[PDB]
Scaffold this active site. Structure first.
Site: not given
Lengths: 413, 413
Positions: A156, A226, A279
């Site tokens: 971002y 992740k 995930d």
């Protein structure tokens, strides 16, 4: 100021040295109307909040609303392409606590620009299920979470260059020749983005999440990352988060790790600090929602998770949110501007209303916040609701945006 | 080879110039046992597949299985730290079509290593609901999708450096001084990852997705991206995907865009090519699942989406998958190695079995694949299932891993 009118009967909120707030009975609260449906929602939010403040405090307290400008309305007031006036940024900082409608951008995000310019490093997204709300899932009542999303770094940051541009060619050349990078599959036609994730950014975010778990007697904090593919960014978030838990909160390993636990110093209850791969986490929020409580995560993951969870509880249109630093708090509607509905008094004002509920609680006005929750609970159960809810209910009475405001105010009795 | 035994009664599959396959009645199929629960699942998969091939073709066809090695078992056969033998990679390419169990890595992903070394640029994940499967959602039958996940680039390239390392210090210095980057919030303690996304990588993936929609008479292809924040990577995926639809498939804009449509040249049906922002998409798959069909997306988004969708249909333990290039196809169990269950004949072999179903269909052996689907449908409806399903059902008969194999074979009659 150029175009801002300071309410003379109001008092500017001030920040104490320990970051606690000095809020009078007559505080000034800046607000940004918002693009599109912000036109419809803003007046209804103000009316509802004023009614709640009246109900809780019998006229002793009153909010002095001060309009400030961002987005399309800012260009109209200040001039062409003045999407974020300098004085808007100054007032947001100086007056401490504010609320905004949705913003768009002409064809980088004004929303992201606000969070970054003001260093509002926490994106706070409570996820609760209101009884009677139609949900796509079988057991929405099992979801009660609070998302702490890192707001100042990750992908971002907006650090990127277009394929085949001279700048992209230069970065790829640097990576290939200086850093020895061989892993770029198609260097001739690759756009490049940069993902920065820091110990410093991680630590301040995770600290806020854990302290929130303590202050609100929550059961656990889950670090979501992740880190098995992104070892030195997402994995580093995980590593630094656990390290801070150990150092600052005296957490100790459960069965040799990686999870940890510590005693809430205010209530005595056990708080588990754990982690989930992002995930897998999107699976587990559906399959075992009761196992999760406070979530601490990165900017991008937080975006995805917050939206998925709002959908899960049937709350896409009523999800509240805040952007916080240690000394500035900006509460916001969490949906888009929905231009085809703008001016038609049709969309759900619930998101900005519940963000205002968060704002009241931040001011220490918990009694007024409770009035809003009560009204919302009752209105939903009565099935007197805007089209977005009404269409998914049986036997509902469909009301306008402003009409829902009236239903809420009625249900403050 | 060093440790591979080529079945002399089998025939090596060959690839025609147009990428079609020459598969005999006695094809050789390499397989990798897999770490952990791969020990339990592999023999059961082989037994089930052999039974299906027998049922469909009355003994005329037979698979000649050839064991090859990766992960822990490879280190045991080849020697310490030989996690991916060179000859394993050579055989996977030369014998064309293969199947693997789950793999771990010692404390980069062997799974990702296989996909990248062999340039298997499509990760193919079908999402279907089997009647009788317990799901966390109200209407799981409305979900029928096929995910095309880009497998060769994105942040999965593994290009990253640890905070405060000399390499990270050098990259940040380059970004700050040469590229004029000011957006790194905490440069002193930042890890850095690189995200490459190319026109070339996008185009080959999207082409496969659209061609799949044509070949299988699907309704739409949705490009899923976060292109409003990542303009030159995720946004570029969107841009190039739409451009390819226009150029190669003659798609034309719907109401001035951004969506498009074209006529299926094989069936005559309309195929919509559209796009969704990734965070919104995670909402819409829950709220309006019937509106989505074939999905084309990037590596990271695809990972998240595939897992979320498998969870949604109650198929976390039976989700099949393939990794494909134009000339190599590797089918795989999609779950982890679950070490605490390894050797206990307990986990669901359904994932590798349904990946084998995909493999059979890839060989042109659709009759045998249909036998597997039939058996699976029947076994689920009979509630004679492994613990992972049994626990969520009422009145189920819980069977072992190998026991479920037997139930499936029985249900081929």
């Amino acid at each position: 100021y150029q175009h801002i009118k300071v309410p003379e009967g109001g008092d500017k909120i001030t920040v104490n040295k320990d970051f606690s707030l000095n809020v009078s009975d007559q505080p000034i609260i800046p607000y940004i109307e918002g693009d599109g449906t912000g036109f419809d929602i803003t007046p209804v939010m103000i009316k509802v909040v004023d009614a709640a403040v009246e109900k809780a405090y019998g006229g002793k307290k009153k909010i002095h609303w001060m309009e400030i400008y961002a987005g399309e309305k800012a260009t109209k007031v200040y001039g062409p392409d003045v999407w974020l006036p300098e004085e808007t940024l100054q007032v947001l900082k100086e007056y401490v606590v504010s609320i905004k409608g949705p913003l768009t951008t002409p064809v980088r995000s004004l929303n992201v620009a606000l969070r970054q310019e003001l260093d509002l490093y926490v994106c706070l997204r409570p996820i609760q299920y209101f009884k009677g709300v139609p949900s796509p899932v079988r057991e929405p009542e099992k979801t009660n979470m609070v998302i702490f999303r890192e707001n100042s770094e990750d992908i971002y940051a907006g650090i990127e260059w277009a394929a085949e541009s001279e700048q992209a060619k230069k970065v790829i050349k640097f990576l290939q020749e200086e850093m020895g990078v061989k892993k770029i599959r198609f260097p001739q036609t690759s756009g490049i983005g940069i993902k920065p994730v820091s110990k410093e950014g991680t630590e301040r975010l995770v600290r806020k999440a854990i302290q929130y778990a303590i202050d609100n007697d929550r059961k656990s904090v889950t670090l979501v990352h992740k880190g098995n593919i992104m070892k030195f960014t997402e994995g580093a978030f995980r590593d630094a988060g656990y390290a801070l838990a150990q150092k600052e909160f005296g957490a100790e390993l459960i069965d040799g790790g990686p999870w940890m636990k510590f005693k809430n110093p205010k209530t005595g209850n056990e708080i588990v600090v754990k982690d989930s791969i992002a995930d897998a986490f999107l699976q587990q929020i559906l399959l075992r929602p009761a196992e999760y409580d406070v979530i601490a995560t990165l900017n991008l993951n937080g975006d995805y998770i917050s939206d998925a969870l709002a959908a899960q509880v049937g709350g896409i249109g009523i999800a509240p949110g805040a952007n916080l630093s240690d000394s500035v708090a900006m509460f916001e509607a969490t949906h888009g501007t929905a231009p085809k509905y703008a001016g038609k008094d049709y969309v759900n004002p619930g998101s900005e209303i519940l963000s205002a509920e968060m704002m009241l609680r931040h001011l220490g006005w918990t009694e007024a916040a409770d009035v809003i929750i009560s009204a919302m609970e009752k209105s939903i159960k009565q099935k007197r609701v805007t089209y977005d809810f009404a269409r998914l209910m049986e036997g509902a009475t469909q009301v306008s945006c402003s009409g829902f405001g009236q239903v809420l105010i009625e249900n403050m009795e």
